[PDB]
Every structure is written in structure tokens, then in C-alpha cells.
Design a protein around this ligand. Structure first.
Ligand code: NI
Ligand code: NI
Ligand code: NI
Length: 361
């Protein structure tokens, strides 16, 4: 086998958003020049796609030129403290590393040899994105600007899409006037703040508004099985995502959708926001804290581990990041054959996993 990952491993791409690598492979398969050797297959893509990777000290957009599928006789599963869970072939590479006076020093380690306590590299800040254009009756904003994203923030944070009706509950009357004002501004349709008998609420009665908001990917409400972040938000610029997130939080988020929680970790990473995920019973809890409680550094040119409050003093001393170092809590070998997948990029690394992780093929 080569250096490869489980088919459910999420990958952030420009062309398809956040997608499991087996589903990306099915879309790029054979679209180019193909080489088959037994159970392994390589395609040199006729049209390279765009993914994200570590390059010149930043997490940025990069080209991906080749795809791979084969079989591995077993896998390694690595669980870290922030909640990353990555399933990879034993020779797949990850990065350990340290913070020094002149930036990060990294070191490749095969997944088979990662042990608990290792500080592996994960992605805290994603640079990238561009304004997305969207698809008469209710007027619709033609690009996904900051105002539309702010509206969608409030909506998905505490709004439902009953009937052909939109309802948004809260206190803080200024938030609710803001939502109605933005609704009139963007869509030309307003609502009245019906002081409901539980608390205050805004309600907009427009059958075609809930419909285009559904087409945008807005969930009918929270507490739904397939709750997901609208695709276009992951692909948007940083200021748009900030307009969304500042509205979505008025700090923890409980969901029943594994996928939606993972997508949220990517959305927050696009703002450099440190995020953890935990699973209580069947529910997922996305917690929004800027780094771990201990940080691996180089002092005296020698390795050391510093608590957070000594690390911050040392870091302010030297001028301080897109990458941080998560702590492994569990390494497991799974002796089970499965299909594995890979994507070749110019940097020989890419950003994937249930939470943004720097993977090295
Ligand atoms: Ni290498
Ligand atoms: Ni940056
Ligand atoms: Ni509220």
C-alpha cells in the first residue's frame, strides 16, 4: 500500500466543499490518465483541483494533481484531545513539532509509530475563500455578502422554518429588529415582532422566502438529523464567515449531526478560532474557547513543554499562527483490510480529517 487514508476522511476542496475522500475519488476517477496495478489505481487528473495545505508557513489554497485508490491490510486510528479522530495507513505521515524563536520546526512520523503524548500538527487558521454567487419574486442577494451571512447566522442559531413561516426567538429586542431590518433590506419582505407568550419572537409570513432559504441549505430548524452548514459558507471569504459566526453566537453548540459538527470545526478554523468537539451519548458538543493547555517549545535549542501561561509570556517575547499542536490520547491498530484513498498536492500535504488536520502523503 501507499500513504493513504480512510474513505470517510473529510477533505476541504474548492470545487466540492468539505467532502469525504471516497466521494471525491468517485468524482475524479479516471478523469485524466489512468494506471492500474492489481488492486491499486492512480489517475493523473486532466484538470487539477484546488485543496488546502501548508505552504510558506500558511494554510492556503494549492493544486491537487493526482488521485489514488488501493487496499490496505490494516489501519491506524489516532484520537487526539481536541477530538480529532483520523484513520490512516500505517506508513501515512503526520507532523510532530515545536514552536521556536524562528517559527515552527516540524518532524515527519509514520502513523504506526505515533504514541500517546505526541504533539501532532493541526490546523487552527484557514486562509482562503472567495465571494460566492447565488441563483424574480422575492429579491435575493446575488453574492453571499456579509449581511446575508449575518442573517443566516441568526436564522440557523435560533430560527425555525415551519410551514412557509420563519420564526426567530430571543430577548434583546435590538437583535430581532436587526433581523427584520436585514430581511427587508435583502429580500424586501419584513415581519412583525409577535410578543409570544414564552418570550419575544420575530415572525415572517412568506411562503417563497422559506423556500429559497431551503435551497440555500438552511436547515428547517436546529435539532434535525442532517443538520449541516450551508456549503457556500465553507468556500466564502473570512469576513463573510465572521459575519455569520458573530451572529450564530450571541459558548457551546449541541447537535445530533456528526457531519454538521465537523463542518463547524472547519468554519471556525477559517477564523482562527480554537475549537474542541466532544460526544456525550449520541449528541456532539462543539466548544469554542486560542491554544491547548500545554505547548511544546524549543528553549536553549532543547525541547521543553510549557504550561499555557508561561508559553504566552515566552511567545509575546518573540512575536506571536496557522498551526498548533494537539495531543494524542489514543493510538489503535485495526487489523482489517479496507479500501484506502490519497490525493497528491504540490506541497505533498493537505488539510483533512473530521477537524482540520495537516496530513502528509
Ligand atoms: Ni516528507
Ligand atoms: Ni493567515
Ligand atoms: Ni437570544
Amino acid at each position: 500500500s501507499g500513504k493513504a487514508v480512510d474513505g470517510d476522511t473529510l477533505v476541504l476542496t474548492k470545487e466540492f466543499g468539505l467532502i469525504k475522500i471516497k466521494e471525491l475519488y468517485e468524482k475524479l476517477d479516471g478523469k485524466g490518465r489512468k494506471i492500474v496495478e492489481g488492486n491499486e489505481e492512480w489517475t493523473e487528473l486532466e484538470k487539477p483541483i484546488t485543496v488546502y495545505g501548508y505552504k510558506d508557513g500558511k494554510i492556503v489554497e494549492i493544486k491537487a494533481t493526482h488521485v489514488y485508490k488501493g487496499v490496505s491490510s490494516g489501519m491506524v486510528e489516532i484520537r487526539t484531545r481536541t477530538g480529532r479522530k483520523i484513520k490512516v495507513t500505517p506508513i501515512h505521515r503526520l507532523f510532530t513539532g515545536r514552536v521556536t524563536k524562528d517559527g515552527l520546526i516540524l518532524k515527519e512520523v509514520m502513523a504506526m509509530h505515533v504514541k500517546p503524548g505526541d504533539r501532532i500538527a493541526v490546523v487552527k487558521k484557514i486562509d482562503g475563500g472567495e465571494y460566492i454567487k447565488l441563483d424574480g419574486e422575492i429579491k435575493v442577494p446575488e453574492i453571499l455578502n456579509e449581511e446575508l451571512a449575518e442573517f443566516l447566522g441568526y436564522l440557523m442559531a435560533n430560527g425555525t422554518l415551519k410551514s412557509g413561516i420563519i420564526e426567530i426567538y430571543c430577548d434583546d429586542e435590538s437583535l430581532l429588529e436587526r433581523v427584520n431590518s436585514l430581511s427587508l433590506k435583502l429580500f424586501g419582505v419584513g415581519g412583525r415582532i409577535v410578543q409570544k407568550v414564552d418570550g419575544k419572537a420575530l415572525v415572517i409570513q412568506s411562503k417563497p422566502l422559506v423556500d429559497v432559504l431551503r435551497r440555500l441549505g438552511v436547515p428547517e430548524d436546529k435539532k434535525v438529523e442532517n443538520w449541516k452548514v450551508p456549503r457556500e459558507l465553507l468556500l466564502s471569504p473570512s469576513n463573510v464567515v465572521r459575519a455569520f459566526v458573530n451572529a450564530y453566537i450571541k459558548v457551546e453548540i449541541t447537535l445530533a449531526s456528526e457531519e454538521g459538527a465537523y463542518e463547524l470545526s472547519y468554519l471556525f478554523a477559517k477564523l482562527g478560532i480554537y475549537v474542541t468537539i466532544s460526544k456525550s451519548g449520541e449528541y456532539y458538543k462543539v466548544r469554542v474557547s486560542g491554544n491547548l493547555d500545554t505547548i511544546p517549545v524549543e528553549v536553549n535549542g532543547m525541547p521543553k513543554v510549557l504550561p499555557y501561561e508561561d508559553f504566552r509570556k515566552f511567545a509575546k517575547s518573540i512575536g506571536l499562527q496557522h498551526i498548533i499542536f494537539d495531543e494524542v490520547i489514543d493510538v489503535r491498530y485495526i487489523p482489517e483490510p479496507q479500501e484506502v484513498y490519497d490525493v497528491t498536492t504540490e506541497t505533498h500535504n493537505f488539510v483533512g480529517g473530521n477537524m482540520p488536520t495537516l496530513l502528509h502523503n
